[PDB]
């Protein structure tokens, strides 16, 4: 795909993705299972006013990805911008 072909494709696809996201159910369980399994991310940083996804990720770990992390020796560290300021900015006392 030429950069112009794929740019057209990406543009239209993203436009429709956002447009119908507005009225289609958010598939967040499987999103979590993607960015935790297909990627095995270690640090999950939630940015917002309150850790609504940090609490939404700790439970997913404790439910579906404990044996997976132990089998792979992964120490997933969840972090939210609300409280984990010193830890995300790598300047923690």
């Amino acid at each position: 795909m030429k950069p112009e072909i794929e740019q057209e494709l990406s543009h239209t696809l993203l436009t429709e993705l956002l447009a119908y996201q507005f009225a289609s159910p958010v598939r967040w369980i499987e999103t979590q299972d993607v960015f935790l399994k297909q990627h095995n991310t270690e640090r999950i940083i939630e940015i917002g006013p309150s850790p609504t996804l940090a609490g939404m990720a700790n439970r997913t770990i404790k439910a579906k990805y404990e044996s997976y992390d132990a089998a792979l020796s992964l120490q997933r560290q969840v972090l939210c911008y609300s409280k984990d300021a010193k830890e995300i900015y790598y300047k923690p006392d």
Binding site: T41, E42, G48, A57, Q77
Partner: peptide, 8 residues
Amino acid sequence: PTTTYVFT
């Protein structure tokens, strides 16, 4: 570490 960013 392999990081990911979610937004509330």
